[PDB]
Amino acid sequence: TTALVCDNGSGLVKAGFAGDDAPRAVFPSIVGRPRHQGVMVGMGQKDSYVGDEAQSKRGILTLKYPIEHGIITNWDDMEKIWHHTFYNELRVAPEEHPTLLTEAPLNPKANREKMTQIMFETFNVPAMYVAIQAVLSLYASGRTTGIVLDSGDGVTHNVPIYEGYALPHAIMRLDLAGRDLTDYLMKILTERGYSFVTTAEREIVRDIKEKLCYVALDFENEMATAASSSSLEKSYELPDGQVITIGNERFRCPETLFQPSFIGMESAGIHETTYNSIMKCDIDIRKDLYANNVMSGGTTMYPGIADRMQKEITALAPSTMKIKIIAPPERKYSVWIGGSILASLSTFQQMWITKQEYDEAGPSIVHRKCF
Amino acid sequence: TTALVCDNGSGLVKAGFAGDDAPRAVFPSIVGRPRHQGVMVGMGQKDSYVGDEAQSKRGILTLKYPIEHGIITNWDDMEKIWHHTFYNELRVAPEEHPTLLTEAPLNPKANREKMTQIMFETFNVPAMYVAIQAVLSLYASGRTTGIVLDSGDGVTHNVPIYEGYALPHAIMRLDLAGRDLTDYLMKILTERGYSFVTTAEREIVRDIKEKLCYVALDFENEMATAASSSSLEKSYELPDGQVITIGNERFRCPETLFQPSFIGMESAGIHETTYNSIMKCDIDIRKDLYANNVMSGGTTMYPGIADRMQKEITALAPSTMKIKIIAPPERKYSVWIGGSILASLSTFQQMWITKQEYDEAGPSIVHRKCF
Amino acid sequence: TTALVCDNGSGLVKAGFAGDDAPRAVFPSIVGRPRHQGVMVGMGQKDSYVGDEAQSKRGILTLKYPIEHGIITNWDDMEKIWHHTFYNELRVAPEEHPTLLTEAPLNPKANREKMTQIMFETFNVPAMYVAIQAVLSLYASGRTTGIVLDSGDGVTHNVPIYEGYALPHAIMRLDLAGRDLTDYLMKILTERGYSFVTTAEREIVRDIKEKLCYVALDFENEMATAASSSSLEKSYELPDGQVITIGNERFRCPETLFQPSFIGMESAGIHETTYNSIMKCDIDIRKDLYANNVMSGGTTMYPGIADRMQKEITALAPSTMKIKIIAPPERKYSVWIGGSILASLSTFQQMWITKQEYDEAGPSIVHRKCF
Amino acid sequence: TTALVCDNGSGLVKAGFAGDDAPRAVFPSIVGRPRHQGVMVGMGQKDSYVGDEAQSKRGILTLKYPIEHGIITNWDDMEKIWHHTFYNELRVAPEEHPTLLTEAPLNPKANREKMTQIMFETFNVPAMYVAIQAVLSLYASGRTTGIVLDSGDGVTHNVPIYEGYALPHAIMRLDLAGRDLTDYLMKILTERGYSFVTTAEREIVRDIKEKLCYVALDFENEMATAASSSSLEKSYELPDGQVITIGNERFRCPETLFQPSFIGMESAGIHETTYNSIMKCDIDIRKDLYANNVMSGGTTMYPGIADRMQKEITALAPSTMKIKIIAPPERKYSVWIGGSILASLSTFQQMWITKQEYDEAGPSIVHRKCF
Amino acid sequence: TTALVCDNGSGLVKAGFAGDDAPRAVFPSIVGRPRHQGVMVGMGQKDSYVGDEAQSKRGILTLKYPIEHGIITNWDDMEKIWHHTFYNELRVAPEEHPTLLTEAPLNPKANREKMTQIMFETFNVPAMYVAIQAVLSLYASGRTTGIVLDSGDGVTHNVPIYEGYALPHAIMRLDLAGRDLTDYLMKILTERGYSFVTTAEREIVRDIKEKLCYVALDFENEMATAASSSSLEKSYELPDGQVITIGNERFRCPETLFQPSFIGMESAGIHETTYNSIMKCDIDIRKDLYANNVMSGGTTMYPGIADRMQKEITALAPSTMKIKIIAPPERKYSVWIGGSILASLSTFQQMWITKQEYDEAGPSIVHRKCF
């Protein structure tokens, strides 16, 4: 029977079947619960809402993310999300479908242990596997060597792979992603008089960030241009009909990716993280890591980030080297595409973790069979 | 046995059976007592008259309203009204009928406490329930979301409800209703030489207000038209055969709904009250509160008030929003219709307050079982 | 010449001279305008009243606050307040006195821009400066490290400072303060039959809140004690001689500081806000933030709030940590005391913004010279 | 030239010059016409008699009052009264004197319209003004705040004024005054066998009421004292030499001021009218309305009415309030004294309605320039 | 005058006087700079902090090590460290004290060239000398023959010396020391959910490594024991009061000394490095190198490393040989003790490099006078 590929990110869930080109079900990973007083009896009122139903009714709901910084904090809500993506969205029975799941590098065991235990004793599958998202992003690119930067909603990580061999000592993880940018835009939108304090308007600020923000090639020149004339200002329409206008905040929000000290973090930018991941490898592969910078995730979808990354890496690298950033138009779903490519391979069918080996070894085989 | 739905307003009492379309008994909530000297012996003279009997004999009676601004001030007269509406009008025994009663928001406890105590120890019912009139007005409209303005004889209140969930912090109450408009018309009818000073002629002024008054779309243009030509003047016939004529007072009387400073009140108009109730809610529901303005009560029955409300709310709201005022022709009795819909539901039968729970918990369960 | 320190809160104005211990002029920030019809000619009738004159004549006035939630909404009224506090209360000429002003964190630019423009082109000063109120509250405490919670009439904010260095990413702002508590007490005083609907009786409800309210150590035990016996009931005398009595409402009103869901807000309490501000900082300073909780403002003057805050923070913090709440008896004016300490320092005289730099740079230097 | 102050009451006319302490001409407002057959030729027989000439010849005249309940019913007789008070009593030419006139509150327009038209086209004045009698009664008292009860021959009205600002929604008008008391004494004087049926003996009954009537402090104790012993009986001498004796009727006649049901009226007493006028105002001014009860008019000249009013208002008001009734010895003419004070003010000279503005605006400016 | 002995390691600085038993000043070699925004004026704020002052204030500082892998990378910070250890800690004038300094083998010239230039033109000394740390570690042991392994914070080196004659072709240098172990513990502490990402918490991880880590005698048996029962788990208290618990990571961290492939290095362990250094010497001295294995440095202070080293060397050496590891309790400071012994010898006073020879030969005599 067809295998299931489910990418469980911190903000979005992308589930579908192996062998397909696009994920069938893409929905936000939120659980909404009522916060006001119900006065009308009956009419099918539910105590919880999952996915697009929580987003459509978000004016009377408190929204919670079960995953924070790539780590599942609430397990009942995560089970609700998995039940919704198995029975309501994909409309399949999980007892007859192997499931491929994704996970961020440098994570604790207990996330993967409880993931395997929930997938084998609650939504009991014939087989399961946990894969690294950067290896799938390199699978979707069609190449073998390269350094992958995957930035999503909680985790931004750099993983270099040369000729199918990964270097785990150069894998870097940074807890700066799109939710931090949404919080920073929430903070700096009060600088013009716009107040967004609750969880429902966090989605509005996230929509503003998705539609109107961009990465500047030169930061100081863009701030000088924004201070000189009002040519970079853009208008947005609120759901209640109000119109807001933003200026430099279109490029100050993603600049925290390159300058984390805007939100008080001591770490370096993503360009310096990529460069330090390259020079922590062997020297004879660094050239092949310079021409194969693969970018994946929804956070890498700003329309100025590839040229800016090429500029900073060329400023850091020696001048005799070719820097080439790979930014495909479908890099928002490249982890799922790589998972669908990997699950359809004939050489992958011996690497599943079946139910018999789970019963024989306990929930600890997942660290000796996966990476 | 069939449940009883009784709407006890400040000016009118509407009682009937659950499952019906119209209330069976609609009569004014007045108690009349003689004020002159009786000279003929016997002939069935009573010390008090309740309802239409007090209205027909009002020339020799002092009329008192037991409810003022939604609060019951006289309890013996209110017991007389309840006895009249149980034994004389509805012609039922209250020991075998559950009773549903209505109440205004932001009221004291002691009204509801003594209401439950009188209904359980004097007209002892198998069950009773107290409901919010705006929820019943939304029940009669057939919809789930909307902001309800209910204006009657004592209380004008705004309650917003989104998807069956009410927002109690945006509930607004204003003590300006039809009795204040009757008093203002009583005051400004002396400006043409007509003197109405007693309680019997207050009913005549109320009849003049019901038949001849209307809400102007533009106030200053209508005053200019009334000062220019005598085309807005209307004639009324008094019970003694006198004929009076009124001009601008047809639209100056309900203008106190939009300008309370005519009677010396510092509060804003009903349109500003509705707009401030909408913007005190969550933003993502405000659009659904803009297209579902539900109007209920006898005070909203002037033939100019819906267009005027749409004009003022569209002037207050942003221009990209759709304002739609819901004014059904049967909105004078919509609270009773919603009560009859609610009492006939199969999911409501577990929300009654029976006599056993009243004996177990005392007369204080009515604040933990009702809203 | 002596510098002027003026704290412009949302409800109160505290103005005086630098180097003093107490503010010279403390008066409410209200502008009153007549709403009735004047019938006596002459006798010095004014079109507006500012300060204590508006409070003494409040029975015939509509009172407006120029500042709402720390943001100046009306600028002519704010200019009237500044003219009253410069020429009538302090009795000084502003052309020969530098002025120090206070402002809430996370505010828009345009408040500070128009503040500098009004202070330099209408009440033209030799120099001016805008300071953060939490830094002044830490100045008045005499210490260097600590986390300051300042709660006034519009803004409740948490700012942590370690060894003179502030952490702006942990600064939290919540729009729940004493005016919201006054409105909630206005709402729940109708539950006993007391109606306060106008702006003049809002001051009466504020006086009731100032004299009779207190913070409960345990909320459920206090509600059980109030429901059991009438030992917590207190009586208050209205200006017209009426006597009211309140029970649980003495501690239900400030409980909105710890449970904002009483007024429909999704935010957490002030204790959780302080704890989340502490854990958003660096770890090695958190111990010094646990023993130096500094409380300032008039909203922190309830006689139960320090012990309750210590209890909730000790419940949130690990058990090996020392929690100490700093609540001095003069914390109602600690912002002014810190401003007077800062303006008298010899190292502060190079940080003024003079008129020449204002003319050279325009009204935009105030964001590069102040914080 | 000196302005004219003319108080046109329902029973008396008080005319004089501005700046004086007492009115120059005080005469009854009656027009007498012959009713018998004249038999002697010539000797200067007139078809009408106005003022004291009609009172001295009242045995052969029918006397008519042109003003009934503060409203002018006969305009030719009112023009005769104005001609008599301009040319015969004051002995002035009205073409060179501005005239100040008084009027009761809650009156029709057409009284004031025809008053202005007659004063500008028949007794054509350079300027004219119409003022409220209660504002003049507060002017004569020398104070600014207070609630004025003015009771004369047709109208008893309560007007509260705080700090020069009047509250028109608390202005109360009652059509019970000295002519109703004269009619009630005329009715109850037949209970001892004395018949007064014509208009000439109405003046005799009015004289009996002025000389012999008084207000009882306790009504039931005084009726018990009158029924026990004949110590309250007083004797009066008729113009034909007959001697009458009255007992309880000395205090039963003004008791209709406190109990209108003696003459079949449903309204409350003057004390309840004053108390309801006080509590219909703002709360913060009610204390200043409790210590400044100003009494004016000839009906308030009974020698028991101030103590009785203090007793009933103290019984109605809460016990922590100071009730003080202001009853000056010259309160019979206080409206004229206040008019003379107002017409002599230098700030009043811009509030006259001149002949040019009357020609420009028609006879309708008097409602936009006066109150 | 007394000579100064200053051991400048990669992590610690140990300075003192010749002829003493213990170093007077031991402090970390860190320079801290502020990273947040200063808001309080004056109060002695410094732009840099050196030594224990940077460690005590590390929550608001970025900490930098001037020496990396035994090579000085930042020279201004190294001059700051030398100024702090000359003027603030030792409290001496460097113009009257000769200074003895230490250096790692197989280092570049330019470190020693700039060291001599800074010591002669900035902190100008009468004389200076640079010595090999292993020769000083053999001086402190009191013996003449032996092979010294010195492992500190950046450099782990093996130097064999027989009868006072060193063999430079058998000197081995490996860039694996305590900072690499701290980084590996930082990496593997995320495996249990503990995140340490900044430079301040690197000191916390270093403290955890110093207090809780140990070297296992048999690695696989210890991993089996840790996987079987929780008897090797230890708890540590964070500065913010949090309690962490570690299991196998107590012995996985120093196992990188024996298995460098844990951090991706191709080199052999320290036991194989020592054995290959022994067999690269002459055969007739190897016996004297087998019984005189001298261990020095802070990295050799784990409480399992001597027995493990004896086990691995006895497994590598032939069975007829006596293996004896010399691990004195004061081997953390043995380089300074040997420097103090060498600087107090009467035969060493002719081997100083004075200022005259520095002026005559330039800064290149230090490679022909030292080793």
Ligand SMILES: Nc1ncnc2c1ncn2[C@@H]1O[C@H](COP(=O)(O)OP(=O)(O)O)[C@@H](O)[C@H]1O
């Ligand atoms: N067009 C866009 N521009 C900027 N950011 C985007 C865009 N689309 C999505 N994002 C951001 O990407 C984040 C999630 O991306 P993705 O990696 O696909 O999901 P997840 O992180 O759940 O795996 C969201 O937080 C969103 O803010």
Ligand SMILES: Nc1ncnc2c1ncn2[C@@H]1O[C@H](COP(=O)(O)OP(=O)(O)O)[C@@H](O)[C@H]1O
């Ligand atoms: N056609 C009408 N036009 C204007 N006002 C009306 C009309 N019909 C009724 N009213 C007013 O509505 C008030 C009562 O309305 P309703 O809400 O039905 O009763 P209650 O207030 O007792 O619940 C009365 O005071 C009356 O003046």
Ligand SMILES: Nc1ncnc2c1ncn2[C@@H]1O[C@H](COP(=O)(O)OP(=O)(O)O)[C@@H](O)[C@H]1O
């Ligand atoms: N004793 C008190 N108890 C409770 N609240 C108080 C007390 N005194 C003042 N307040 C509240 O403090 C608020 C203003 O405090 P403060 O911060 O000094 O002024 P501002 O907010 O204008 O800076 C007022 O709204 C008032 O309700």
Ligand SMILES: Nc1ncnc2c1ncn2[C@@H]1O[C@H](COP(=O)(O)OP(=O)(O)O)[C@@H](O)[C@H]1O
């Ligand atoms: N001493 C008195 N005692 C009682 N009533 C009096 C007395 N003097 C005058 N009145 C009454 O006052 C009435 C008129 O008073 P006043 O207000 O001065 O005149 P007007 O009503 O015409 O303005 C008369 O009807 C008269 O009966």
Ligand SMILES: Nc1ncnc2c1ncn2[C@@H]1O[C@H](COP(=O)(O)OP(=O)(O)O)[C@@H](O)[C@H]1O
């Ligand atoms: N008790 C201990 N256990 C394990 N490691 C230690 C201990 N004490 C110190 N260290 C390590 O030794 C290193 C420095 O040792 P040392 O050689 O004395 O200083 P330097 O390397 O600066 O010359 C530090 O990185 C520290 O982690």
Ligand SMILES: [Mg+2]
């Ligand atoms: Mg992802």
Ligand SMILES: [Mg+2]
């Ligand atoms: Mg109703």
Ligand SMILES: [Mg+2]
């Ligand atoms: Mg303040």
Ligand SMILES: [Mg+2]
């Ligand atoms: Mg009068």
Ligand SMILES: [Mg+2]
């Ligand atoms: Mg060393």
